[PDB]
Amino acid sequence: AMASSADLTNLKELLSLYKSLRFSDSAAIEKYNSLVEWGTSTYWKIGVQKV
Amino acid sequence: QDPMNSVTVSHAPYTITYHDDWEPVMSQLVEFYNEVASWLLRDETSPIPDKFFIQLKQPLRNKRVCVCGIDPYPKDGTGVPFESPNFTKKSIKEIASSISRLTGVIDYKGYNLNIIDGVIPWNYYLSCKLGETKSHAIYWDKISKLLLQHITKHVSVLYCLGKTDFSNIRAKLESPVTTIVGYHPAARDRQFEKDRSFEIINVLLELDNKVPINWAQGFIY
């Protein structure tokens, strides 16, 4: 899609996990890493990396 | 005027003035322009040839976002991408309504993407024959790749307007750059109205430790 409300929701969630970066379960960290993957594929390059 | 330079080409507009930040591409631009311009010039164009390159007066090093349309307005192009000095073109009015809806600014007289800190508005092709979108694609092709690749060395985010027009944009660029392709303001079914590209760009900027764009600066009162 690239430019939808749904895309914005995902990027805002990625940004939120990035600002904390203090994962206390496997879900949060795999959510972070899988969002990075999606954002990289969708937008070609993004400023955050997997962890 | 010292941060500005000029080079000579062999066809109108004969002189191209450019900000220092463009220096690395100017030799190539001359060579490319000299080989196609006379073909280009057989046609009346938007913008006029004396305005083809006026956006090269913009610095690039303070730029975080490029907002890119495929080519100039079919008529009345000013050499500043998206610019409509008396606020008449549909696309600039639509962009402005999006920004109005986003920022809550409701009374305005104009909007210009070129007076926003951090934004470089851009037309991929630098002219068209009057009245006919994309008619100069064939002539601008190498130049367009040259210049957009240069821009994308500087900006964090490239935002292209036109799903169809930019479906192949990654292929025209060398090094990856954050690239959002959204609807053109004239898309069917009010789809541009639903598009959240300006907000997306700001989140992407934050993800890149960059300052988001203050889109309300574009308003003219």
- Unique residue bearing structure tokens 């730029």: B63
Structure tokens at B189: 């079914």
Burial of B38 (0-12, 13-18, 19+ CB in 10 A): exposed
Check B71, B76, B117, B141 and give the catalytic one.
B71
Q: Which CATH superfamily is domain B1-221 in?
A: Uracil-DNA glycosylase-like domain (3.40.470.10)
Q: Reduce the DSSP state of residue B41 to 3 states and report it.
A: coil
Tell me whether residues B203 and A15 touch, CB distance under 8 A.
yes
Q: What is the resolution of this structure in A?
A: 1.9
Which strands form B157-161's sheet, in the order they lie side by side? B119-123, B65-69, B157-161, B178-182
**Using the 8-state DSSP alphabet, how is residue B54 labeled?**
G
Amino acid at B110: G
**Cα–chain-centroid distance for residue A25?**
16
Q: How far apart are CA B96 and CA B153, in angstroms?
A: 28
Whether the link from the prior residue into B121 is cis, omega within 30° of 0, is no
A18–chain B Cβ distance below 8 A for any pair: yes
Q: Which residues of chain A are within 8 Å of residue B156 when distances are taken between CB atoms? A: 47
The SS3 call for residue B90 is helix
Helix, strand and coil in chain A, % to nearest 5: 65, 0, 35
Find the discontinuities in chain A where C to next N exceeds 2.5 angstroms and give the residue preceding each: none
Question: How far are the Cα atoms of B10, B54, B149, B174 from residue B30, in angstroms, in the given order?
Answer: 9, 15, 16, 21
Produce one character per residue of B95-108: b if its CB has 16 or more CB atoms within 10 Å, e if not.
bbebbbeeeebeeb
Q: How far is B176 from chain A (nearest CA, A)?
A: 6
Q: Which amino acid is present at B117?
A: D
CA separation, residue A41 to residues A26, B30, B59 (Å): 22, 36, 30
d(CA B155, CA A8): 20
Please check whether residue B158 is in contact with residue B205, taking contact to mean a CB–CB distance below 8 angstroms.
no
Report the CATH fold assignment for A1-51. Helix Hairpins (6.10.140)
User: What is the number of other CB atoms lying within 10 angstroms of the CB of residue A43?
Assistant: 23
**Residue B43 bears catalytic tag:** no
Could you tell me if A3 lies within 8 Å of chain B, comparing CB atoms?
A: yes
Chain B residue closest to A36 (CA)?
B207
Name the token pair of B61.
Answer: 């090093």
Cβ within 8 Å, pair B194-A18:
no
> Determination technique for this PDB entry?
X-ray
Reading the block at residue B171, the tokens are 């292929």
A47·B180 Cβ contact <8 A:
no
A28 to chain B, minimum CA–CA distance in Å?
Answer: 18
Considering only CB atoms, A44 lies closest to which of B178, B199, B209, namely B178
CA distance A13 to A35: 8
Neighbours of B150 (CB within 10 A): 19
Cα-Cα-Cα-Cα dihedral sign, residues B192, B213, A43, B82: positive
Spatial distance between the Cα atoms of B122 and B113, rounded to a whole number of angstroms:
10
What single letter denotes the amino acid at residue B180? I
Q: Where are the beta strands (DSSP E) in chain B?
A: 4-8, 15-19, 45-46, 65-69, 110-111, 119-123, 128-129, 157-161, 178-182, 219-220
Overall size of chain A counted in residues? 51
CA torsion, points A40, A44, A48, A51, in degrees to nearest 10?
40
Nearest CA in chain B to A11: B203
Q: How far apart are CA B21 and CA B114, in angstroms?
A: 17
Strands (E), B11-89: 15-19, 45-46, 65-69
CA dihedral A31→A37→A41→A47, nearest 10 degrees, is 100
The answer to whether the CB atoms of B207 and A5 lie below 8 A apart is no
A21: left (phi over 0), alpha (psi -120 to 50) or beta: left
Q: Where are the domains of chain A?
A: 1-51
Question: What does each C-alpha distance from B79 to A34, B24, B114, B122 come to in angstroms?
Answer: 42, 21, 11, 10
Q: How far is A51 from chain B (nearest CA, A)?
A: 14
Joined tokens for residue B83: 């610019």
